[PDB]
Every structure is written in structure tokens, then in C-alpha cells.
Amino acid sequence: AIINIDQELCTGCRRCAEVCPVDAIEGEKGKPQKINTEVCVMCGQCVQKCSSYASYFDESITPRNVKLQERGMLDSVKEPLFAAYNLGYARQVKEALENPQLFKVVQCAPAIRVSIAEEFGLDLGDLTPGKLVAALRRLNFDRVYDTNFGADLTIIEEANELVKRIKEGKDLPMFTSCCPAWVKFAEQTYPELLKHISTCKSPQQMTGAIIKTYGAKINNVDPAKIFSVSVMPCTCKSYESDRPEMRSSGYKDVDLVITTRELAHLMKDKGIDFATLPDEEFDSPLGNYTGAATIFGNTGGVMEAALRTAYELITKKPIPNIDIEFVRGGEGIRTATVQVGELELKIAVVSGLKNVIPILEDIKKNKCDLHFVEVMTCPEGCISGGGQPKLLLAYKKRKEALYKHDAELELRKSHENPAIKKLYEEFLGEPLGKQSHHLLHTKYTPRK
Amino acid sequence: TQLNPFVVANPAKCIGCKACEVACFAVHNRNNHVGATVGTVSIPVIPRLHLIKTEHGTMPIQCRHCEDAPCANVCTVGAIKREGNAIVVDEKLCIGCKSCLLACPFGAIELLPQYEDGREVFQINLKLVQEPRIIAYKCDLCNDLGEPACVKACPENALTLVMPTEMKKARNKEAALSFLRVV
Amino acid sequence: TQLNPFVVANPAKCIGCKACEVACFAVHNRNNHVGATVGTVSIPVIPRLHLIKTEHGTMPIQCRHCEDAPCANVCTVGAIKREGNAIVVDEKLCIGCKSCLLACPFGAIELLPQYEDGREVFQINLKLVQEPRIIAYKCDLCNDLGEPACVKACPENALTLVMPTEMKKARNKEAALSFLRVV
Amino acid sequence: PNRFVIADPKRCLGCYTCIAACAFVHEEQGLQPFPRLYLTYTSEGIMPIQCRHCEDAPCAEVCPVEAIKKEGNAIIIDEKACIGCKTCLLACSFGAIDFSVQDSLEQSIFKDIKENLMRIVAVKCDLCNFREEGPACVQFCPTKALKLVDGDEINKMVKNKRTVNVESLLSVYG
Ligand code: 402
Ligand code: SF4
Ligand code: SF4
Ligand code: SF4
Ligand code: SF4
Ligand code: SF4
Ligand code: SF4
Ligand code: SF4
Ligand code: SF4
Ligand code: SF4
Ligand code: SF4
Ligand code: SF4
Ligand code: SF4
Ligand code: SF4
Ligand code: SF4
Ligand code: SF4
């Protein structure tokens, strides 16, 4: 029970059945609905199109005090409660934070810097990294890191995988595993294509594997009392963080995840304002990143970052490819062709999960061969996931802020990070060198 | 002096999504720190139109803005006045004398606590704790702000702002064309 | 699309025995607890076709099911519709505006109280007694039920159901055969 | 059933006499001075429109105060108890109800007369039941366009049309 619909508030308005990419909700034009939790793909977008908000001025329902216990939210938020509710993880994070024994480390996703500022009565899509890191340090967090380290790591891994696979072509139309909902859907309906999906882990799991093994040696702490919490803008990472095949060194790479709304609730409970907070910086050993890792929030950013280094790995000499405009969009299926290394690439990206089913078919993929296709279950990338707050019913402001943050940095190619060079020199050696295959990869074999 | 408009529902194209009340609550409470985002709402929610569901479907009901309004006449203090084209309650002078709830036959007025600057508003001398001030809430047809917000937020486009003068002319012309084509 | 059939009477063989109205009344009031036996009828009798007599013979007349029906055009509510091959009246949207009586030149529509479940229907708010509800009555060609009941109840077979397309073909063939046998 | 009044558009000049008579009779009686018979201009013909007295009303079923009621053989508004809830204006198909407001008058000769001469409530044709004479609209018309139809005139017209149809069908071809 993660994505549930309360039956004392739902009026059967059926508006949440028009955006579900699986049709996991069963009901009628009237009467309360119900979620088929055995087929649900956990996209989280049936939450932001719900508007039954039944108030507590009547005693015909629960008294709005036990409801916050069931939802798992904090007891001092007093926000309106809807019907299709996400499960809460704030109480466990607060209780773990109150413990002064566990070394605490938190991870920031590349959409928290543009979404949380709307929770405190500011402009829509305001880039405040320094205020965010200052608040996270003021939350009694011992270490704060950016998951963009794992983003650059998985870009390098995906580029190396593409260069390896283009030679001796074997499952050439591969897909990326950045979106756990897509992997869940592939397990659901197409078990015969579990080998097409690339074996790269998500950047969150990249940083989770790095912290528990490499991060224990950069400091003087044993890798057993470390407590890792990741702030991801999606209801999509909770299922990825507790799979039995998604751990290394015996311990979970990340303990539990919280959406942006939960972090805002924690900040409100701590009673600290946001405008007064000064500007700070992240921890240098595991928080340095380049511009290419910043645009994972918007669609087409993963493909752009992968291309920015695959081009160099293919032609071995620099050609300016920082700016690309044929892979930008917000709806439908986007495609482009790139001529590099005397080879043509018919690259494409898909917005939504229902849109990829046409070109996923084994006969439709046999005409263009679809050299590189990534996936985002929520439309317009992760910036419209279940973690982002409601808008009381836009999306362009956050992606424009992310693009401006990308353009304002002095590093564009996802290889100039000194942290990556140091990590390769000290810990991993070479990519895909029997050490990356243990920590940086996983095998998708449910076959259910 | 001319007829006042009033919003009316449409039971054929209403579902019961409650997405028209939230827009009203968000547009009226701009002084209680709302930023069109759930999470900045630190106050309980109070709409103006009320959705009612029965065997023959569901629809919202609200104030019809009567001309010889019973609610305005029974109010001894003088809170309810026809300030603009529509009929509006005044929050400064209301004392909660519940005669309004015995006047309006539709029931578009509800007594709820006031919330100003994001906090509950208390009284001077009552009970030993304090007690909140109770005000009458009803539709004011968004006279202070722009066009109505319950419309432009209905996904099915069911709510309509009807002026009772043009509708009569349209119905008259329809009847005249229907009868004159047969004789 | 196909032209609506309409039942017609042959006056040279009709007697006026009024055995055709009774069958229609019995066949349309199965929901009023009639068991094809006089004595179970607790409802006043209302037929659909109406019999009249003049100096030159007796016959009944009924709805001719006009294609460009004036009765459908006059009604502003829209109760009269062409549900099937025939044109029918709806007893749920009728309001009693007698203008449909001023449209039909054949006078096949009569405004009479509605009877359901063996008892007279009563309107909700009228005057201190309750006024009955009045609905239009006309021939609907028994589309919901089986074959027309006015036919198969006339002893002289004066009532005939005609198709206004095949009959024209028969007339054309007879005229051609009559003309060609002389030339 | 109920008695009402109908105006065939063949002999209506739009001379505004019936409208003014209906207004002024109700004014001198002591009721609202506004007319209850509306002249409408169309693409093909001009016909006055009034309250065809519906036998189920669609009016008394929406009034919350129960002001509209059937009296004698007509539908009576009972203005004293009416409050102004514009609900019967939604449920009238022909649009036979207007409200007693100065702006409800269209610009015409009648407006000039009423402005050179000198409560808001719903007014409807009450068929002039308070007057020993017939309706004022049918009586003051220069061309006698309007006519009052009873419960028996409908039956007479129906029987006449039915007999004419039967006799014609008999005489011409069986
Ligand atoms: N892991 C991971 Fe990703 C990163 O970094 C997030 O956290 Fe995304 C976001 N925002 C989510 O959910 S997943 C898909 N790739 C684009 S972004
Ligand atoms: S979370 Fe997504 S897949 Fe699951 S029921 Fe909601 S909309 Fe459907
Ligand atoms: S949107 Fe909310 S209220 Fe409407 S059917 Fe879905 S869960 Fe129920
Ligand atoms: S797009 Fe991001 S938030 Fe949405 S399902 Fe995929 S990983 Fe989760
Ligand atoms: S409750 Fe307020 S508005 Fe109503 S009558 Fe009393 S003072 Fe007037
Ligand atoms: S509150 Fe009721 S009585 Fe007062 S104007 Fe509105 S609908 Fe009429
Ligand atoms: S018209 Fe305006 S004030 Fe009235 S219910 Fe609609 S949104 Fe609210
Ligand atoms: S928004 Fe429209 S459809 Fe939804 S409850 Fe309101 S009136 Fe009905
Ligand atoms: S009486 Fe019934 S059928 Fe005749 S016009 Fe009125 S609504 Fe239509
Ligand atoms: S009721 Fe009269 S006018 Fe209407 S279709 Fe039948 S015969 Fe023609
Ligand atoms: S066809 Fe049916 S409805 Fe018409 S007169 Fe005959 S029995 Fe009555
Ligand atoms: S049953 Fe036949 S013979 Fe008897 S009255 Fe009717 S049409 Fe004439
Ligand atoms: S009195 Fe007669 S002619 Fe003059 S406007 Fe009235 S209906 Fe027309
Ligand atoms: S306006 Fe008068 S007649 Fe019409 S519904 Fe309201 S009270 Fe009844
Ligand atoms: S006002 Fe209109 S709906 Fe009501 S009885 Fe008169 S004509 Fe019929
Ligand atoms: S009957 Fe009397 S009240 Fe009705 S329209 Fe004619 S003059 Fe006016």
C-alpha cells in the first residue's frame, strides 16, 4: 500500500483515470474508486489530478487526527488532505535525525533547487542552491551531497556501454534505466525485452553505492552506522530503494526516500524561514559536478549529457556540440539524427509511458532500429513527478531555470570533473573493469 | 437599476470533482498567504458554493442574488447590503445572529470561523479559553476581483454566468421561430 | 432511411363497432394490471385512434406520422421524437403546453391525465387539493410491442397498415399494365 | 383545462396597443405597471408572446416559497409572497416571465409614454381574472389578432378539423 485512494473522500470523478499510463484503477462513473496495486506502475501522477478535499468541519468522517497517522505525514502540517494520497516517510526521517549516534548523509536531486522555492511563497521556478544547502546543513545533517555526481557517473557508464555495444551489435535499440517506473512496466508487460534495457543504475543508486563503500574511507567512520537519505522529486524511487537486487556491501545503498513536499514539511516543522537563509556550498569530496548533470530534470537532458561525451569517445577530437535544439520538446515522440564517426545515429526520446508502446513493438523497431531511446514515465521528465507540489488545478519555469543553471556553469562536457578523475584513479581503475560491474550495474531478471 | 447576474450549474455536465470550490477558496484568500500551491495553505479550507449529490446526479448550489433578498431584510445589524450589482455580506459588522439561516430557502450561507493573516481570529471577552469569531460565508460573485473563478476552473464547462435579460430574449425568439414556421 | 408506415381505415367496410379502440387501450395499459378481462380494469378508458361518423359513413382516424411533423416542431421541450420507424410521444418530458393541439390538422393528439400502476398520477406542487398531471396521447404504431393491435381486432379488416413506397410501385405497375393493354 | 390566449402573426401590425393596455390596466388596478405580453421580432414575422398556461406549469415545481399556484383556470403568481429568486426564469420554455425592473423595457413608443407620464418582483400574465370584462389584450387590439381559447373551444376546433378531414377523404377517394 503505497499509492492509495481514500474511500471516504473519493466521489468517482474519473479524472485520475485519464492520465494513468497503466489503467490500474477500477470503478464506475460513480462510487469510490480503488487502485489495483498488483499492476500499478507507481508513476505518482494520479495524485496531482485529485481535488476532493473533504474538510474537517463535519464529524461524518475521521477527525483529521488519525488521518495524518495513516498517511505517515507529520503531526504539525495542517495542509488540506486529498483523496489519492501518497504514503509518508517523514516520521522515520525525523526519528533517525533525533538520534545523535548515526552519521547522517543526505542527497539532493537536480530538481529540488527549482521546486522547493514555491513552497514558501516565492516566484515559480527560482534557483536557490545556496539557501537549500544552508537549510539542509541547518537540519542537523552531517553530510550533504548532490546526486549529480552519480548523474555524471552514469553518463560516463552509458556512453562507454554505447561505444561497447555499437561494436558487435547485440540488442542495439537499448533503453536506459533512469526511470524505475519504466523498468517496472517492462517487468509488467514485456518480460521478453528485459535484456534490451541498459544495465546502468540510477544516479541515486550510484551515489548510494559510492557512499557506503568509498565514502567510508574518505572519512574515519565505519560503513555500518552511516544513514543515507535521498530527496527525490518523485514517488518513483521508494520501490527502487528496497529491491533485494539493489544493494552492495551487504547494506542498503539508500535507506529511505522523501519527496519534495516532505522536505518542505520538515522545514516548516523545524520553524526556519527560507528567505533569511544565507548561501552556502556543498561538500567538495562528493558534491562537485558539471553542467551536463544538471539537466536530468527536464526531458532530453540525459540524452544530451550522454551525447556530449559519446561524441568525444567516438571521434577523439573536440567538436562544439554544447547547444542542440532538435531534441527539445514537451509532448509526443522526439527524434533526431546525428552523423558522428562515419556512423549515423537515429536517436529518440519518449514523453510519457503510453507513447513508447508503438515504437517498442518488435516489428516497429525493425525499420529504423532506434539506436538510442530513453524513457520518462511522467511527462516532461521528472520535474512533473509525484514529488512536486500541486498547482491548485507552469511547468516551463522550472525547466527554464534548470537550463539557465546549465548555461551559467563553466564546465559543459561531463568529463572535466576532477572528482571523477580522482575516483577513477583511486577506486575503480578503468570503467567496466570488474569493479564497476559489481557496484555500478544490476541485472533485471524478475521475468514474472 | 437592472437585473443582477448569478451563476448557475448544469446537472447534465457535472461529475462531482470538487475542482470548482478549490479555485474559489484560493482566489478569495490571497491575504492569507496562498501561492497557488498546496503547502502554502496554512488555514482550513472554506468554499462559497456547495456541491450536493443525490439519486438524480450531483450539482453545486450557491447564492442566486435575489433582488428582494430575505437575507438582507432580516439582518438587523445591517451586514448584508447590495453594495455592487451583486449582494455581498460584510465581515466587519456581522455578529452571527443566525436569522440568515432561517431566511434563505436555498441555504447558500454558512457560518464558519474567520481566518485573517493566516491565523484564527479570536474575540475579546468569551469562554477558560478564548472562542473564535464566526462569520457568514456566501458567494459575492467575485465583485472585488475579476471574472468568476468557479467558471474557468470547471473542466467539463458546466457552470455558466447567466444574465436573466438576454436569456429571456433568446427563449422568446426560439419560441417565436418555432411557432411561426408552422402556421 | 425509410418512410414511416401509417395505419389507415377503409370506410366502405367499417361498421363503427368500436372494437378497435378497446384492443388498443388494452394493449397499451399492460402496466395498469389488465388481464384481457373486464373487471380487472380500474382505469378510465383512453384509446389512441378516434372514431367519428358523418352522413356518408363512419370511420376512425389516427396519427398519419408526417415526415415534416408540425407537432414535433411546435413543441419547445422536445417530447415528441421519432424513436423508431414511427413517430412517438414521450410521457416524461411533456409539460402540458397545448400548442401541439394547435398544430396537428388531423387532430390525433388528446391531452388527458396520465395513469400508471393502476392509480392516477398527481403533480407535486399545485392547488386545497392536488392537481393531476396531463400528458398527450396519440398513436405510436405499437413500436415497443408487437404488431399493431388495431389490425387483427377489426372483424371486417377495414384497418390496413400501408407502406407508402411499395404501394406506389404497385400503382405504377397497374397503371402501366392498363395503358399497355390498350395501345 | 386551462384558458389561455393565442395570437396568429397574420394580423399583428406591432402597433404596441395591447402591450400598453395590459400595462395600464394592471397599473390602475393596483398591481405592477409592467406589461406581461412581449413583442418579439424575428427573421420571418412578428408575434406577441405571453404565458400559454401550462397544465403542469414547470413553474410551481421550482418556486421555493410556493408563490405560483393554480387558481380558477389559470396560473397565478401571487406577487405578495414572491422573493425574486430567478428560478422560474430558468424553467420557462417560452420565456413568459420578466421581472419588474425599469431596464427591462425596450426602447419603443410605450417607453416614451411611460416616461412622459411620470419593489422588484416577477410578473406573469394572470389572464385579467379580476376584471368582469375579458382580457384587455384581446379587447383593445385594432385588428383582433389575439383570441382567447377556452376548454371547450379546443374541443370544437378538434372536432371541426377531424370532421372536415373525414368528409374530404370520403368524398374524394376512399
Ligand atoms: N535517479 C534518478 Fe534521476 C536523477 O538525478 C531523479 O532523481 Fe529523476 C528527477 N528529478 C527522478 O525521479 S530519474 C530519471 N532521469 C532524470 S532525473
Ligand atoms: S500511481 Fe500512476 S499508475 Fe498507479 S494508479 Fe496512480 S496514475 Fe495509475
Ligand atoms: S481524482 Fe480523486 S476524487 Fe476523482 S476519481 Fe480519482 S481519486 Fe476519486
Ligand atoms: S519520470 Fe522521474 S518521477 Fe516520473 S516515474 Fe520516471 S523516475 Fe519517477
Ligand atoms: S449572521 Fe451576520 S449577515 Fe446574517 S443576519 Fe446576522 S449579522 Fe447579518
Ligand atoms: S443568500 Fe439566499 S436569500 Fe440571500 S440573496 Fe442569496 S439566495 Fe437569496
Ligand atoms: S462566482 Fe466567484 S465567489 Fe462565487 S462561487 Fe464562483 S468563484 Fe466563488
Ligand atoms: S468543477 Fe464543474 S464538473 Fe467539477 S464539481 Fe464543479 S461544477 Fe461539477
Ligand atoms: S403538451 Fe407535451 S407534446 Fe404537446 S407541445 Fe407541450 S410538451 Fe410537447
Ligand atoms: S400527431 Fe398529427 S401532425 Fe403530428 S405526425 Fe401525427 S398526424 Fe402528423
Ligand atoms: S397501431 Fe397501435 S397505437 Fe396505433 S392505433 Fe393501432 S393499436 Fe393503437
Ligand atoms: S374495429 Fe374495425 S369495424 Fe370496428 S369500429 Fe374499429 S375499424 Fe370499424
Ligand atoms: S394590439 Fe394587435 S396588432 Fe397591435 S401589437 Fe398587439 S397583437 Fe400586434
Ligand atoms: S421569482 Fe418569484 S415566482 Fe419565480 S421562483 Fe422565485 S419566488 Fe417563485
Ligand atoms: S411561465 Fe412559461 S413555463 Fe410557466 S406556465 Fe407560463 S408558459 Fe408555462
Ligand atoms: S390577459 Fe391581461 S394580463 Fe394577460 S397579457 Fe392580456 S392584458 Fe395582459
GROMACS .gro file of N, CA, C and O in nm, chain D residues 52-81:
model
  120
  866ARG      N    1  -4.864   3.092  -2.224
  866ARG     CA    2  -4.952   2.979  -2.251
  866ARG      C    3  -4.962   2.894  -2.125
  866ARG      O    4  -4.864   2.833  -2.083
  867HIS      N    5  -5.081   2.890  -2.066
  867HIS     CA    6  -5.096   2.839  -1.931
  867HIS      C    7  -5.073   2.689  -1.926
  867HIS      O    8  -5.165   2.609  -1.949
  868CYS      N    9  -4.949   2.651  -1.896
  868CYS     CA   10  -4.908   2.512  -1.894
  868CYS      C   11  -4.984   2.437  -1.785
  868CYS      O   12  -4.995   2.485  -1.672
  869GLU      N   13  -5.036   2.319  -1.819
  869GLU     CA   14  -5.115   2.243  -1.723
  869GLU      C   15  -5.030   2.175  -1.616
  869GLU      O   16  -5.085   2.130  -1.515
  870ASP      N   17  -4.898   2.166  -1.636
  870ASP     CA   18  -4.807   2.125  -1.531
  870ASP      C   19  -4.714   2.237  -1.487
  870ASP      O   20  -4.635   2.216  -1.394
  871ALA      N   21  -4.719   2.353  -1.554
  871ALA     CA   22  -4.655   2.481  -1.524
  871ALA      C   23  -4.505   2.491  -1.547
  871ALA      O   24  -4.458   2.600  -1.583
  872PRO      N   25  -4.424   2.382  -1.536
  872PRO     CA   26  -4.283   2.396  -1.494
  872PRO      C   27  -4.241   2.519  -1.414
  872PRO      O   28  -4.126   2.561  -1.423
  873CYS      N   29  -4.332   2.578  -1.336
  873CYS     CA   30  -4.305   2.699  -1.259
  873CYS      C   31  -4.326   2.678  -1.110
  873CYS      O   32  -4.240   2.716  -1.030
  874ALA      N   33  -4.438   2.619  -1.072
  874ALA     CA   34  -4.465   2.590  -0.932
  874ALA      C   35  -4.380   2.476  -0.878
  874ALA      O   36  -4.378   2.455  -0.757
  875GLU      N   37  -4.310   2.403  -0.965
  875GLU     CA   38  -4.219   2.298  -0.921
  875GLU      C   39  -4.080   2.350  -0.888
  875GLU      O   40  -4.000   2.275  -0.831
  876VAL      N   41  -4.049   2.475  -0.922
  876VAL     CA   42  -3.918   2.533  -0.891
  876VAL      C   43  -3.927   2.648  -0.791
  876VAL      O   44  -3.822   2.693  -0.742
  877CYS      N   45  -4.046   2.696  -0.759
  877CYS     CA   46  -4.059   2.806  -0.665
  877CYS      C   47  -4.037   2.756  -0.523
  877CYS      O   48  -4.110   2.667  -0.478
  878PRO      N   49  -3.938   2.808  -0.450
  878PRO     CA   50  -3.912   2.757  -0.315
  878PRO      C   51  -4.008   2.808  -0.210
  878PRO      O   52  -4.027   2.741  -0.108
  879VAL      N   53  -4.069   2.925  -0.231
  879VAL     CA   54  -4.161   2.984  -0.135
  879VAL      C   55  -4.306   2.943  -0.162
  879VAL      O   56  -4.395   2.972  -0.081
  880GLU      N   57  -4.330   2.871  -0.273
  880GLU     CA   58  -4.464   2.829  -0.316
  880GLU      C   59  -4.555   2.949  -0.339
  880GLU      O   60  -4.661   2.963  -0.278
  881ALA      N   61  -4.510   3.037  -0.428
  881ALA     CA   62  -4.588   3.154  -0.466
  881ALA      C   63  -4.679   3.129  -0.585
  881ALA      O   64  -4.790   3.184  -0.589
  882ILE      N   65  -4.636   3.048  -0.681
  882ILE     CA   66  -4.712   3.024  -0.803
  882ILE      C   67  -4.812   2.912  -0.777
  882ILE      O   68  -4.774   2.805  -0.728
  883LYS      N   69  -4.939   2.936  -0.808
  883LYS     CA   70  -5.040   2.835  -0.783
  883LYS      C   71  -5.152   2.847  -0.885
  883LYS      O   72  -5.172   2.951  -0.947
  884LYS      N   73  -5.226   2.738  -0.902
  884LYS     CA   74  -5.336   2.733  -0.998
  884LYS      C   75  -5.464   2.781  -0.931
  884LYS      O   76  -5.507   2.723  -0.831
  885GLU      N   77  -5.524   2.886  -0.987
  885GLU     CA   78  -5.648   2.941  -0.935
  885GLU      C   79  -5.747   2.955  -1.049
  885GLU      O   80  -5.711   3.000  -1.158
  886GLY      N   81  -5.872   2.915  -1.024
  886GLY     CA   82  -5.973   2.918  -1.128
  886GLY      C   83  -5.938   2.826  -1.242
  886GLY      O   84  -5.946   2.703  -1.230
  887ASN      N   85  -5.899   2.884  -1.355
  887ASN     CA   86  -5.848   2.809  -1.469
  887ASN      C   87  -5.718   2.870  -1.521
  887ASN      O   88  -5.690   2.865  -1.641
  888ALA      N   89  -5.638   2.929  -1.432
  888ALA     CA   90  -5.516   2.997  -1.474
  888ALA      C   91  -5.407   2.975  -1.370
  888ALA      O   92  -5.430   2.920  -1.262
  889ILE      N   93  -5.286   3.017  -1.406
  889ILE     CA   94  -5.169   3.010  -1.320
  889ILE      C   95  -5.143   3.150  -1.266
  889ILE      O   96  -5.121   3.244  -1.343
  890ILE      N   97  -5.146   3.165  -1.134
  890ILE     CA   98  -5.140   3.295  -1.068
  890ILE      C   99  -5.009   3.306  -0.991
  890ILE      O  100  -4.966   3.210  -0.925
  891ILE      N  101  -4.946   3.423  -1.002
  891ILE     CA  102  -4.812   3.446  -0.950
  891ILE      C  103  -4.813   3.468  -0.798
  891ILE      O  104  -4.717   3.429  -0.730
  892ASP      N  105  -4.919   3.528  -0.743
  892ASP     CA  106  -4.927   3.567  -0.602
  892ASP      C  107  -4.805   3.651  -0.562
  892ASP      O  108  -4.719   3.610  -0.485
  893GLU      N  109  -4.802   3.772  -0.620
  893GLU     CA  110  -4.685   3.860  -0.613
  893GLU      C  111  -4.641   3.889  -0.469
  893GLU      O  112  -4.522   3.911  -0.444
  894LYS      N  113  -4.735   3.887  -0.374
  894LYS     CA  114  -4.703   3.927  -0.237
  894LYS      C  115  -4.597   3.837  -0.174
  894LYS      O  116  -4.512   3.884  -0.098
  895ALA      N  117  -4.600   3.707  -0.204
  895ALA     CA  118  -4.506   3.613  -0.145
  895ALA      C  119  -4.381   3.590  -0.229
  895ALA      O  120  -4.291   3.519  -0.185
   0.00000   0.00000   0.00000
